[PDB]
Structure formats: C-alpha cells, structure tokens
Design an enzyme around this catalytic site. Structure first.
Site, PDB file in Angstrom:
ATOM      1  CG  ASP A 130      45.983 -45.148  -7.917  1.00 31.04           C
ATOM      2  OD1 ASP A 130      47.081 -45.602  -8.325  1.00 31.04           O
ATOM      3  OD2 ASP A 130      45.635 -43.956  -8.105  1.00 31.04           O
ATOM      4  NE  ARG A 146      49.244 -42.223  -7.529  1.00 31.00           N
ATOM      5  CZ  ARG A 146      50.124 -43.143  -7.918  1.00 31.00           C
ATOM      6  NH1 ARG A 146      51.418 -42.851  -7.987  1.00 31.00           N
ATOM      7  NH2 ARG A 146      49.711 -44.360  -8.246  1.00 31.00           N
ATOM      8  CG  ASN A 147      46.432 -42.188  -4.069  1.00 26.82           C
ATOM      9  OD1 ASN A 147      46.168 -40.995  -4.200  1.00 26.82           O
ATOM     10  ND2 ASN A 147      46.429 -43.032  -5.087  1.00 26.82           N
ATOM     11  CG  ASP A 183      42.917 -41.373  -4.554  1.00 26.83           C
ATOM     12  OD1 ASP A 183      42.512 -40.290  -4.064  1.00 26.83           O
ATOM     13  OD2 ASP A 183      43.552 -41.444  -5.638  1.00 26.83           O
TER      14      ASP A 183
HETATM   15  C1  LIG Z   1      47.844 -32.123  -4.928  1.00 24.64           C
HETATM   16  C2  LIG Z   1      46.721 -32.961  -5.507  1.00 24.64           C
HETATM   17  C3  LIG Z   1      46.905 -33.053  -7.006  1.00 24.64           C
HETATM   18  O1  LIG Z   1      45.500 -32.275  -5.272  1.00 24.64           O
HETATM   19  C4  LIG Z   1      46.704 -34.379  -4.931  1.00 24.64           C
HETATM   20  C5  LIG Z   1      46.049 -34.564  -3.578  1.00 24.64           C
HETATM   21  O2  LIG Z   1      45.017 -35.211  -3.430  1.00 24.64           O
HETATM   22  N1  LIG Z   1      46.765 -33.961  -2.563  1.00 24.64           N
HETATM   23  C6  LIG Z   1      46.455 -34.171  -1.175  1.00 24.64           C
HETATM   24  C7  LIG Z   1      45.200 -33.431  -0.785  1.00 24.64           C
HETATM   25  N2  LIG Z   1      44.966 -33.491   0.645  1.00 24.64           N
HETATM   26  C8  LIG Z   1      45.717 -32.810   1.557  1.00 24.64           C
HETATM   27  C9  LIG Z   1      45.207 -33.084   2.804  1.00 24.64           C
HETATM   28  C10 LIG Z   1      44.111 -33.959   2.621  1.00 24.64           C
HETATM   29  N3  LIG Z   1      43.292 -34.504   3.534  1.00 24.64           N
HETATM   30  C11 LIG Z   1      42.363 -35.287   2.974  1.00 24.64           C
HETATM   31  N4  LIG Z   1      42.159 -35.579   1.684  1.00 24.64           N
HETATM   32  C12 LIG Z   1      42.985 -35.024   0.785  1.00 24.64           C
HETATM   33  N5  LIG Z   1      42.888 -35.247  -0.592  1.00 24.64           N
HETATM   34  C13 LIG Z   1      41.899 -36.042  -1.166  1.00 24.64           C
HETATM   35  C14 LIG Z   1      42.180 -37.123  -1.981  1.00 24.64           C
HETATM   36  C15 LIG Z   1      41.145 -37.854  -2.522  1.00 24.64           C
HETATM   37  C16 LIG Z   1      39.848 -37.491  -2.234  1.00 24.64           C
HETATM   38  O3  LIG Z   1      38.822 -38.193  -2.785  1.00 24.64           O
HETATM   39  C17 LIG Z   1      38.447 -39.372  -2.222  1.00 24.64           C
HETATM   40  C18 LIG Z   1      38.167 -40.380  -3.110  1.00 24.64           C
HETATM   41  C19 LIG Z   1      37.765 -41.607  -2.637  1.00 24.64           C
HETATM   42  C20 LIG Z   1      37.642 -41.808  -1.282  1.00 24.64           C
HETATM   43  C21 LIG Z   1      37.920 -40.784  -0.404  1.00 24.64           C
HETATM   44  C22 LIG Z   1      37.782 -41.041   1.048  1.00 24.64           C
HETATM   45  F1  LIG Z   1      37.028 -40.109   1.693  1.00 24.64           F
HETATM   46  F2  LIG Z   1      37.192 -42.235   1.320  1.00 24.64           F
HETATM   47  F3  LIG Z   1      39.004 -41.074   1.641  1.00 24.64           F
HETATM   48  C23 LIG Z   1      38.328 -39.549  -0.864  1.00 24.64           C
HETATM   49  C24 LIG Z   1      39.563 -36.405  -1.433  1.00 24.64           C
HETATM   50 CL1  LIG Z   1      37.967 -35.870  -1.034  1.00 24.64          CL
HETATM   51  C25 LIG Z   1      40.598 -35.685  -0.900  1.00 24.64           C
HETATM   52  C26 LIG Z   1      43.977 -34.202   1.270  1.00 24.64           C
END
Ligand SMILES: CC(C)(O)CC(=O)NCCn1ccc2ncnc(Nc3ccc(Oc4cccc(C(F)(F)F)c4)c(Cl)c3)c21
Length: 281
Positions: free
Chosen positions: A132, A136-137, A150
C-alpha cells in the site's frame, strides 16, 4: 521469534484520530509496568483465514527496525486487535505537504524521497512487501525525518499493472507505488489521475500513457518516476539505486527542483493534555 502483549490497564487516556477503511486509529499514553516511562502511542484497531494471516505479518515486526520504518511496540487484545506504535508528532505526510504548499523547499523534498526509498530498501532486506505504499502512509517524526507505516492488507491508482490484473505483489511492484508517491510529493500533494475513473486505468496504462511531469520538476527527476512505471517490471530500478540517485540530487537540489524563495495542524492539536525520547527500549 516472539510477541509483546499489552493489557489495557497500561494504555491510558485514549482518544480517536480517524476511522480508516482498515479500521479505527486512536492516540494515548502508554505506561508499561515496572518501567516508569510514559509513552505517546498510536493505536490501530482493525475490523476466516484472514486472521491466521495476522500472525506471520506482525511477527516479522520483531527484529531491528530502520530509522525510516514505523516500528510496532506490541498488541492489546480485548475483543479486538489493537496494534500499538509510538506516536509521530507531525501526523501524516500528505496532510503535511498539503498544509505546507507555500513554505516548503526542494532541500526538504528530496531529503524525504531519499528517506522513504531507504526505508523501502530496508523492508526490501527483511523480505516483507508493503502493498500500500502511498504518501498517505508516510508519517512525520520531525520536519526532516519521516517513517513508512501500514504494510498489511482498493487503491488502484498507486498500484502496478500486474498488481491490478494478476494480483501479484513483488518489491518491484512496490517501486511503482513509490514512483506515484514521489509524484504525489512533487505536486504538493495532488491526486493522481484525477477525474479519470479507476476502470480505465489498466486499459490505458497499456497505451503507455502516464502521470504528467510535475510543474516544479526537472527531467532528471521526472525520468525516475517513469522508470518506476515500466510495464516490464524487471526494467524498474532496485530500491538501492533509488537511494543513491536521490542522494546525488540532495547535494544540489535547486539544480533538480525549482520552487521559489513550516507548521502542522496535527502537531498543534497535540499541544493539549499530553512527546519526546524515541523509546526503542
Ligand atoms: C487519520 C487516519 C484515518 O486515522 C489515518 C492515519 O493513520 N493517520 C495518521 C495517524 N498517525 C499520526 C501520527 C502517527 N504516528 C504513528 N502512527 C500513526 N498511525 C498509524 C497507522 C497505522 C498503524 O498500524 C500499523 C499497521 C501496520 C504496521 C504498523 C507499524 F507499527 F509497523 F508501523 C502500524 C498504526 Cl498503529 C498507527 C500515526
């Protein structure tokens, strides 16, 4: 190989960010037991043989995460799966480049493309395909240092051709996604193939037709976007290559990107009721 279970009692003062298609995203403070630390975290909570997939995926999240890759801390299991990761203070990159259209420079812009490429170069090493990759990611740790997140699945316009038609995903197909991500950034966050609906894309990607050169872009930078968008996926550049070149350009960016002569809404929103030390414990 191992896995870190978080129990809710640790996860404190928890507020919503957004309801994405893959699920909901919150924020909060993490207080691991025995450790006196407080940690600002991002919590994702998603929505038969899809579940068994949810193991081998995040088990790969053991190991030594790259400075440019978002690193998972562990999981809270309630009646749903909460993935927990450290909070990136400047939120998502797309928002960031959108909000910063005016102030941004070429010094900053290439610096990132290097970073993302270097992050992808690392995941390339650890044998995990992203699927993906899109602006956005990408998350913003600091105005100069960014992380990819992601990797875990309907976005056709960032997808490769084989990815559309055969539904096969290599690292080479992630490069296409990358190309689109770079264009995204050189367009100050434009939406790719706007108005052109998703049905026709494959059909006319075959016509060798591609995204137009961004305004602020030189041919030297534009060649690389097209390089990624080769149907002949083997003739796409290796991520290592991308990093090297993007490093070249960073040492005289005004020769490669032409702009003129820095805030976040999200960061501003955090300054209330709860952000330092990285904490890779
Ligand atoms: C507005 C919206 C619709 O919520 C979109 C949205 O995600 N907005 C940004 C959210 N955001 C803001 C600061 C920030 N710092 C860190 N993670 C964020 N978001 C986030 C995204 C995906 C996640 O899930 C995964 C899945 C797979 C792998 C991983 C890994 F840990 F390896 F990176 C995490 C998680 Cl836990 C968090 C953050």
């Amino acid at each position: 190989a191992l896995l870190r279970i978080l129990k809710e009692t640790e996860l404190r003062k928890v507020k919503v960010l957004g309801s994405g298609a893959f699920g909901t995203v919150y924020k909060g403070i993490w207080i691991p037991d025995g450790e006196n630390v407080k940690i600002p975290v991002a919590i994702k909570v998603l929505r038969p043989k899809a579940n068994k997939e949810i193991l081998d995926e995040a088990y790969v999240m053991a190991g030594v995460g790259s400075p440019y890759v978002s690193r998972l801390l562990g999981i809270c299991l309630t009646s749903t799966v909460q993935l927990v990761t450290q909070l990136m203070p400047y939120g998502c990159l797309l928002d960031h480049v959108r909000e910063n259209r005016g102030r941004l420079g070429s010094q900053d812009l290439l610096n990132w493309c290097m970073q993302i490429a270097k992050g992808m170069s690392y995941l390339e090493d650890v044998r995990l395909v992203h699927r993906d990759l899109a602006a956005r990611n990408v998350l913003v740790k600091s105005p100069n240092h960014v992380k990819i997140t992601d990797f875990g699945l309907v976005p056709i316009k960032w997808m490769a051709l084989e990815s559309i038609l055969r539904r096969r995903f290599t690292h080479q197909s992630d490069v296409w996604s990358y190309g689109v991500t770079v264009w995204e950034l050189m367009t100050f966050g434009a939406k790719p193939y706007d108005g052109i609906p998703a049905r026709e894309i494959p059909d006319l990607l075959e016509k060798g037709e591609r995204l137009p050169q961004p305004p602020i872009c030189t041919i030297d930078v534009y060649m690389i976007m097209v390089k990624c968008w080769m149907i002949d996926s083997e003739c796409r550049p290796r991520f290592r290559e991308l990093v090297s070149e993007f490093s070249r350009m960073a040492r005289d960016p005004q020769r490669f990107v032409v702009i003129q002569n820095l805030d976040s809404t999200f960061y501003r929103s955090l300054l209330e009721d709860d952000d330092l030390v990285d904490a890779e414990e």
